[PDB]
Design a protein around this ligand. Structure first.
Ligand SMILES: [Ca+2]
Ligand SMILES: [Ca+2]
Length: 445
């Protein structure tokens, strides 16, 4: 119902959210139990921007002041522009810096979602901004006066939103920068999630390793993704989460909509993996915090499967883990949230014949009345004849992480409450499932 965009400062995770009108504030130690702390801004004209800690008092509000740079409509023309708000009480409440934007609209329709970072090497702030099909970069010494430095022009991935810019140390010991943004590659058969480019950033401009982006999710439902620092350490791992939008699938003329607008994804951890050469990829996995939700565990012996094998289990909300291996089959995977008559299920698996991983929601409750968005697909090498799955199943979502999680699929899916079976499957050949474990979870969401 309420999208969260977390940030770590002063010993806790925080997020702020609009509530109709006013800006509210929630806090968390574990990214499980969020506690609302009240109103941070009594009157505010989804919210768009970033919150930073000005540790060295560059902005003049004091060492450790909390500063938000936010997109709002201009008083004159309603055009998107960037305004500064500051807190001198540790992020409890914020006041506006003057009445003028710190970065005004240059007469354009798309000018939003400032992502502000401190560039220690260049000794300055940098802002990445969504500007239609390009990401704009702006520099500042003091958060108040900004200067354009460059633009990063995207190609064939629609309108860009919610850019991200961060530095990570890969497992080979090389630092890379990553430029990310939400985007919409559906016209080219690519995802509508979070596109990213590993590369280099010099304080002024971003140079990608390759022109074509990688995607942090290949599911249908992982939009407006955000990454944030790990507070209990910063270069080795980050956290991320995104929005899974149900209302945006509405495709009727009347404008009424159900009560379910969407849901946050689970929080994932992301690491930067060297894949050989100058090739790097982000790898995703559910946060480890999630294991404190484990109610019980079912473990299975090695299972050979040809066609079908039905598990003797009831599972509704859970983490499934398994290793699978095979030889010459066409496809392999899991029928999750399976009805007793076997007609309803959620399918997660590998197409060896097609060279892709998939999640198919065409046999369960699903949000698209046109039945266009049924089976998400991500590249999978057809020569690789083993895979590890980690799958989080909940009442309205399935989130599948393949191997180390370079490819992940996040999808809305709406199984019936009593559809709780699991059947393993193959097509045109035998597979072996090993180390199959089901961790039954309490649902937070
Ligand atoms: Ca979409
Ligand atoms: Ca859309």
């Amino acid at each position: 119902n309420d999208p969260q965009k977390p940030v770590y400062f002063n010993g806790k995770y925080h997020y702020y959210y609009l509530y109709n009108t006013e800006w509210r504030h929630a806090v968390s130690d574990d990214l499980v139990h969020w506690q609302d702390q009240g109103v941070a801004i009594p009157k505010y004209t989804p919210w768009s921007g970033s919150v930073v800690v000005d540790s060295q008092n560059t902005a003049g509000f004091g060492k450790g002041a909390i500063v938000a740079i936010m997109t709002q409509p201009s008083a004159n023309d309603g055009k998107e522009e960037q305004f500064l708000w500051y807190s001198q009480n540790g992020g409890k409440t914020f006041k506006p810096y003057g009445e003028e934007p710190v970065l005004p609209n240059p007469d354009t329709v798309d000018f939003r979602d400032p992502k502000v970072i401190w560039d220690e090497e260049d000794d300055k702030w940098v802002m990445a901004l969504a500007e239609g099909t390009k990401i704009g970069f702006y520099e500042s010494q003091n958060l108040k006066e900004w200067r354009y430095t460059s633009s990063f022009q995207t190609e064939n991935i629609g309108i860009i939103e919610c850019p991200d810019l961060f530095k990570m140390r890969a497992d080979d010991g090389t630092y890379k920068w990553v430029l990310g943004a939400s985007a919409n590659g559906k016209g080219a058969g690519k995802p509508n999630t979070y596109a990213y480019w590993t590369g280099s950033f010099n304080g002024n401009e971003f140079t990608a390793d390759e022109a074509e982006p990688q995607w942090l999710d290949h599911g249908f439902d992982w939009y407006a993704g955000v990454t944030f620092e790990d507070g209990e350490t910063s270069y080795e791992k980050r956290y991320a989460l995104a929005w899974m939008n149900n209302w945006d699938y509405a495709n009727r003329t009347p404008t009424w909509k159900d009560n379910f607008n969407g849901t946050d994804s689970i929080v994932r951890q992301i690491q930067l993996k060297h894949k050989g050469g100058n090739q790097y990829s982000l790898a995703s996995h559910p946060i480890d915090q999630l294991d404190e939700l484990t109610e019980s565990t079912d473990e299975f012996e090695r299972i050979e499967v040809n066609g079908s094998k039905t598990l003797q289990i009831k599972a509704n909300t859970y983490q499934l883990e398994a290793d699978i291996s095979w030889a010459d089959l066409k496809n392999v995977g899991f029928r999750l949230r399976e009805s007793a008559d076997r007609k309803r299920h959620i399918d997660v698996g590998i197409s060896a014949e097609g060279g892709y991983s998939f999640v198919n929601r065409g046999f369960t409750g699903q949000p698209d009345s046109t039945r266009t968005y049924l089976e998400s697909k991500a590249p999978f090498d057809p020569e690789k004849k083993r895979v590890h799955f980690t799958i989080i199943v909940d009442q309205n979502t399935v989130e599948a992480f393949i191997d180390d999680g370079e490819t992940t699929h996040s999808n809305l899916a709406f199984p019936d409450l009593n559809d709780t079976g699991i059947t393993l499957f193959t097509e045109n050949g035998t597979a072996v499932f090993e180390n199959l474990k089901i961790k039954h979870l309490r649902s937070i969401r």
